[PDB]
């Protein structure tokens, strides 16, 4: 069975864990529980095909950043998450992507840009600005809400499809 | 004050620690669809630990949760 090693990255509090838990099961955590490191495994069907996802949910708090080199070397695709009401988390995306490429010594790393918390009326990052950033990166952009489950599966499955194509580019 | 815990089905978590092992691993098991009453927790270098063990007493060691 085909396997995909997904890694969820982004600043603290953007919703990485909430998104991951929503994918694994239908449940929205509404509490403060910062991640150190958590790995999840789930069998899914994508485009009619059964796949096994290994999802690494990483720490946004910089005190744990020493772990990044290792999980960036091992990960096959990266879900790069910011919150649409947190401009700083959007600015942090650039350096996560740059560090991933630095660690993997490659300009072609499967990635998806994710703007989370789209259920909020208070927005500071326009959809159009984030779409344009993704356009220039050459990667997909998806706006999600872990609270409402809007486009959560789409985000992870789009990342899988990016990896699936990258493997065939060989 | 962290403990690395290997979980069933090739999963893992790192927990920050004074509460027992059950209380501090309850959430990690629940979001993965695991009932603590169906699992045992072990200290590596395997010896079974009581779920009510103080997690503070295990800081620095690696634990493993396996289906019973
Ligand atoms: N309104 C709203 N709140 C959300 C959403 N996703 C997460 N949250 C809230 O945002 C806070 C942070 O969520 P969490 O998933 O723990 O964020 P994180 O990115 O994993 N943080 P860390 O990097 O420290 O582990 C929590 O209060 C969570 O309830 C969302 O889509 N909408
Ligand atoms: Mg988290």
Residue numbers in the entry:
A (entry chain A): 1 to 170
B (entry chain B): 56 to 72, 75 to 102, 109 to 131
The authors write:
KRAS, the most frequently mutated oncogene in human cancer, produces two isoforms, KRAS4a and KRAS4b, through alternative splicing. These isoforms differ in exon 4, which encodes the final 15 residues of the G-domain and hypervariable regions (HVRs), vital for trafficking and membrane localization. RAS proteins act as binary switches, transitioning between the active [guanosine triphosphate (GTP)–bound] and inactive [guanosine diphosphate (GDP)–bound] forms. We present the structures of both the active and inactive forms of KRAS4a, as well as of the complex between KRAS4a and the primary effector protein RAF1 and compare them to previously reported KRAS4b structures.
To gain insights into the interaction between KRAS4a with its downstream effector RAF kinase, we solved the structures of KRAS4a bound to the RAS-binding domain (RBD) of RAF1 at 1.65-Å resolution and bound to the RBD and cysteine-rich domain (RBD-CRD) at 2.65-Å resolution. Figure 7A shows the superposition of the two complexes aligned using only the KRAS4a components. Strand β2 of the RBD contacts the N-terminal section of strand β2 of KRAS4a to create an extended β sheet bridging the two proteins, whereas the RAF1 CRD interacts with KRAS4a residues located on the interswitch region and helix α5. The β strands that form the intermolecular β sheet align well structurally, but the loops and helices of the RBD show noticeable positional heterogeneity, reflecting the flexibility of the molecule away from the β sheet that anchors it to RAS.
